[PDB]
């Protein structure tokens, strides 16, 4: 449970845009829902020591209305590889000796490409378009006060890639408390994913503040107290 | 009893969409019933330490009504392989010495492809179509308060694959309680499955809330208290 | 008496659909009666630690009435092989030393294919068709309250295969209770079956609840108390 | 977390314009927003021991108005490379022995090119052009008193380059406080980025002081007390 895709997205984030917005993508499949314009749920938001996250939602903004100008191609070539080994001991007085040696090789030379909805295109959308009010999905959203958020920019693989991630572990117990249980668990896993083209790797988020009656906006000030359905 | 197909589905899940929805497929044969639109029974639902599961049911939603737009092809190539060995001892005072050494190699370089019923297609279905009320199957379902669920998205093998899974075990007892029973059980199994194309590997679930008289929906809020037949 | 065909069916079951329905086939010959639509007798039904079983019956449902749409081909390739060796000792005070070493190699790389009567086809059958009442067979069945069951889906060998299963045993006694009976029984058997095409391997069951006068059904709720002839 | 792009920008800055203006670029992607004419937010401004920083903002000055004369090509070829190794010990009285050995190789032979908005072109812009007052973005900016700043000159890669940065670490603990925890964490990462053409590396900033009603300027005196929206 040091999964592949999440670790890759986290690594490329810390390489690419530390300090903030870009949140990696936890579920690999749902990229087609983490496209731009799309919606997301708070889902254990950030800390100073954690990384905020969100989840899928099967309705985007165009569908939930009653302007396709995706504008950027900032491209990059991230080649990460590492081999982390760890070895810990514990020698307590019952002769209880624990000793765990793990290791983990990761390898990925992938491409990245960026997208963004034009602020002009958006502002014009919110300007002319208008929100519905009988839409069942959002009807329940306002019912239950989700404070859902929205993704502005994505981070995609401009071409199909693969990731490799292998691990090993070897942990022994030696405890003459229960008949000298001398045990040695172990494993040596490998993993090889073929990240398909278009799979968003890291995405950005942006609040969706819908006014009473009944239009909406997506301000820059996403203050902690901000809320979608007042 | 470390079966092959279930372990594969579990591994690909933790590789692909941890944290939630995707539940592996326990029975291999019933994929043709775990297709999208299909129904499922609670069957020892989730915990914080377990993985929710469900079962077959021989009637889908189209049949149980009185719109085929399966929309996604997010594809992936999962190559897992590992060799876990375990060795435990027990040396208690009757000279009772137990010692078990097991091992397990698993290997699978398979393909995966994803499906999803379009929310638009669905909403339009639930809109125009309407539920029957004399259907015998559902008649008993409402009789007995099953709280059945529904599968939205599937996870299929875009082409035929095979899985290999072998194991070994060697467990000795040495107990001078019954005439020094010194025993050594052992085994070395192998297994090779040919996963046929189209066999759903992991699937997703979604509640089916049918209102009194007599239409229905499948909300996003699948709250614990939610129920199919009120 | 670790027969071949039953062990194979049991192994493929635990590989294919654990946890429930699929019951292996004990008698090899009677597959032509364990076809779909067919009937079966309770015959030491399940436990939490056993595997339910049934038996032949020389009349199916079509014959016992006054719609051939067998619909599935979910196919599989099960390759099992193992070599289990066991060795036990007993050294009790009369110098009675028992010591048994057995072993067992099994090998089978077979194909499997699945069948199922369409729920629609069935429901229409039960709808239009109707049960007889002078049929002698069922006359005795209602006489004697058999609570017979019915098979919906089968599991067949899409082509002819063979199974190999050999065993060995070597058990010695050394008891100076009767003139120092020092004995050593032993054996080394082999077995090779040629499973013919179409031989159902595992089958599924389904109750047959016939109402008073005089039609019938086969509900999903097969509750323990359920009964064929009230 | 000794990221690549930031370290490169910092190194080239200290090589190129120490002592002041040029602030490196923290996020790699947002160069298309750190182009000239663009806006930025204070975001933990400078110290005597730190390096001021800023962030993206999705609206430039041309858009926020109701003159393209980018004038410079001062070009350079920075080839940096180094291998810093560090090794520290701690030997305190509980037998607690900590010992950490890290290392870091960085390599980059890149090109640099400079840009600047002509002071004449600017002065004429601010002269004829005039600020809007209903623009939503800036409406919130004046609401919340951001004291946003503006970028005059950029520092770009006149052609596509790559950067390489690898690291290693090996830190051991030896503490007979908890059962003689003798541990050894370690790692050996590598990283290879393909900096695309046009990616601003270091940029310069410049305040934006908008007068009451309702025009603006960007003075040379950027005094600490200066403020965008009085």
Could you give the order of the helices and strands of chain A? HEEHEEHHEEEEEEEE
Biggest interface, which chains? B-C, 43 and 45 residues
Q: Compute the number of structural domains of chain A.
A: 1
The whole-angstrom Rg of chain A is: 23 Å
Number of strands of chain A: 12
Counted by DSSP, the helix tally of chain A is: 4
Share of helix among residues of chain A? 10-25%
Structural class label of chain A: alpha+beta
- What percent strand of chain A? 25-35%
Biggest β-sheet of chain A, characterized? 7 strands, antiparallel
Report the span from N to C terminus of chain A: 39 Å
Oligomer: part of a larger assembly
- Dominant shape of chain A: elongated
Descriptive account of the structure:
- Chains A, B, C, D: It comes from Mus musculus.
- Chains A, B, C, D: Residues 2-230 are annotated as: Triggers pyroptosis.
- Chains A, B, C, D: The chain crosses the membrane at residues 75-92, 96-117, 161-177, 181-195.
- This is part of a larger assembly, with four copies of chain A (230 residues).
- Chain A is of the alpha+beta class.
- Chain A has one domain.
- Chain A is 16% helix and 34% strand.
- Chain A contains four helices and twelve strands, in the order αββαββααββββββββ.
- Chain A has helices spanning 4-16, 61-64, 119-128, 136-144, and strands at residues 23-24, 39-40, 75-91, 97-114, 149-150, 154-156, 163-175, 181-193, 202-203, 206-207, 209-210, 216-217.
- In chain A, strands 1, 3, 4, 6, 7, 8 and 9 form a seven-stranded antiparallel sheet that branches.
- In chain A, strand 11 (209-210) and strand 12 form a beta hairpin.
- The A-B interface holds A 1, 3-6, 26-32, 55, 57-59, 63, 136-137, 140, 144, 162, 178-196, 199 and B 14-20, 22, 72, 74-93, 96-98, 109, 114, 116, 119-120, 123, 152, 155, 217, 219-221.
């Amino acid at each position: 449970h040091m999964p592949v895709f999440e670790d890759v997205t986290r690594a490329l984030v810390r390489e690419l845009n530390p300090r903030g917005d870009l949140t990696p993508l936890d579920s690999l499949i749902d990229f087609k829902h983490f496209r731009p314009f799309c919606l997301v749920l708070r889902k254990r938001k950030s800390t100073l020591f954690w990384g905020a996250r969100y989840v899928r939602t099967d309705y985007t903004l165009l569908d939930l209305l009653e302007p396709s100008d995706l504008t950027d191609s900032g491209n990059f070539s991230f080649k990460n590889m590492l081999d982390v080994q760890v070895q810990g001991l514990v020698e307590v007085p019952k002769t209880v000796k624990v000793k765990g040696t793990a290791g983990l090789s990761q390898s990925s030379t992938l491409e990245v490409q960026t997208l963004s909805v034009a602020p002009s295109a958006l502002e014009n959308l919110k300007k002319e378009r208008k929100l519905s009010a009988d839409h069942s999905f959002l009807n329940e959203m306002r019912y239950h006060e989700k404070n859902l958020y929205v993704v502005m920019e994505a981070v995609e693989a401009k071409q199909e890639v693969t990731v490799e991630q292998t691990g090993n572990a070897n942990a022994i117990f030696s405890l003459p408390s229960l008949a000298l249980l001398g045990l040695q668990g172990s494993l040596n896993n490998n993993k090889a994913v073929t990240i398909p083209k278009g799979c968003v790797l890291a995405y950005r988020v942006r609040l969706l503040r819908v006014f009473l009656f009944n239009l909406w906006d997506i301000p820059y000030i996403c203050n902690d107290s901000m809320q979608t359905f007042p």
